[PDB]
Ligand binder design. Structure first.
Ligand SMILES: O[C@@H]1[C@@H](O)[C@H](O[C@@H]2CO[C@@H](O)[C@H](O)[C@H]2O)OC[C@H]1O
Length: 392
């Protein structure tokens, strides 16, 4: 695995691209998304500052809301790209405005998943893959830059947040939406991330939230009393992808049950299909395989998913039944980008075509560029051999 060797595959170099052109492609994507035209290209906004220095956020330009996921992805992108100033400004806004510090609030220890640009929460409850990326990005920051003090003691922040994600108690109290009850972010017996800590829907998961590549980091550097739990979560997630991904297409549903079956949310029953969340599952298991080499099923799964998408050439949808029926939409940059990341584990040389398709793309513009753009820039970093485990 790359962590053992320190050698991360440069999949773009493997399909013949020069290092100068790979650097240009990543820098163009960063400059567009972080510093491009505010109305058409950028998803990052400089939002003044406070006692900790500059504030900034990554946001969904469509709804015009800040998302905890996009903040956490901005932190991961910026630490992988050695962009400390941008990292610190995003983290300052997330910790200042999104993090719930009241111990009587049911979201204590968690980041509001959806927040207006003025800091008014739409929902105090979290999207738990945001927390997973925040903690990991903070550990990576500690490793690359060393720890600062206060909110910039990245390792201390990560330890405290991650401990509370596991050990949170049930809290009932007032929220922006009325009285709510929430629990921990990982089920203590299943050792799986929840879709939500809201007690009304807590005993569910989401395959795209399963991040065994990161749980292995936490198994090494988290508070000692939790390391066995995070190690377990990594093994459970590898088993989860084996059960949750269709046996023929390797498509996963957006939302799921702990036993691997798809879950139809009452408010979103189409969550049983492969949609916007599920795009990411293949990145998660392929990254885990490339880093750690433990998910013995990952190569075949990535091969099945790329074989399936090869049947869709010239008629690509972005919504599918798990058995591979197209359910609508055309090609998206986010799905192209995630499919390319399957090459971190695929064995069949059709993966070349998927990495080449990502290489051919341009940075996204217009109303849907937030999800397309964060996935694009993460996929470019993975495929350039520039998305690494920075272990403190
Ligand atoms: O109260 C809970 C809501 O907070 C939860 O909202 C979800 C949070 O993650 C987002 O990615 C989803 O889009 C959003 O629906 O839904 C479940 C409910 O119990």
């Amino acid at each position: 695995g790359a962590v053992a060797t320190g050698e991360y595959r440069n999949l773009f170099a493997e399909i013949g691209k020069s290092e100068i052109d790979i650097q240009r492609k990543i820098d163009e994507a960063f400059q567009h998304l972080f510093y491009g035209d505010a109305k058409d290209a950028a998803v990052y906004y400089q939002a003044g500052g406070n006692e900790n220095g500059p504030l900034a956020y990554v946001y969904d330009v469509n709804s015009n809301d800040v998302r905890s996921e996009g903040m956490s992805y901005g932190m991961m992108i910026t630490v992988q790209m050695d962009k400390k100033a941008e990292f610190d400004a995003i983290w300052n806004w997330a910790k200042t405005y999104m993090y719930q510090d009241s111990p009587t609030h049911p979201a204590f220890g968690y980041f509001a998943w959806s927040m207006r640009r003025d800091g008014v929460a739409n929902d105090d409850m979290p999207a738990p893959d945001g927390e997973e990326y925040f903690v990991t990005a903070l550990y990576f920051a500690a490793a690359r830059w060393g720890n600062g003090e206060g909110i910039f003691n990245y390792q201390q922040e990560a330890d405290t947040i991650l401990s509370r994600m596991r050990h949170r108690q049930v809290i009932t109290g007032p929220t922006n939406r009325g009285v709510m009850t929430a629990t921990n972010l990982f089920h203590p017996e299943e050792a799986q991330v929840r879709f939500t800590p809201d007690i009304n829907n807590a005993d569910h998961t989401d395959a795209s939230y399963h991040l065994p590549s990161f749980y292995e980091i936490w198994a090494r550097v988290a508070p000692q009393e939790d390391r066995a739990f995070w190690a377990k979560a990594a093994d459970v997630s590898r088993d989860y992808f084996a059960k949750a991904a269709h046996p023929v297409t390797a498509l996963t549903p957006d939302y799921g049950n702990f036993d691997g079956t798809p879950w139809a949310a009452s408010w979103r029953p189409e969550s049983v299909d492969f949609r916007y969340d599920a795009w990411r599952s293949v990145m998660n298991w392929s990254m885990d395989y490339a880093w750690w080499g433990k998910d013995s099923g990952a190569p075949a799964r990535s091969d099945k998913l790329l074989a399936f998408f090869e049947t869709q050439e010239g008629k690509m949808n972005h919504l599918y039944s798990l058995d591979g029926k197209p359910l609508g939409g055309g090609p998206t940059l986010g799905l192209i980008s995630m499919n390319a990341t399957a090459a971190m584990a695929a064995t069949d040389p059709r993966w070349h075509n998927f990495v080449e398709k990502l290489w051919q793309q341009q940075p996204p513009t217009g109303q849907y560029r937030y999800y397309d753009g964060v996935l694009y820039l993460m996929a470019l970093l993975h495929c350039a051999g520039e998305y690494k485990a920075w272990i403190p």
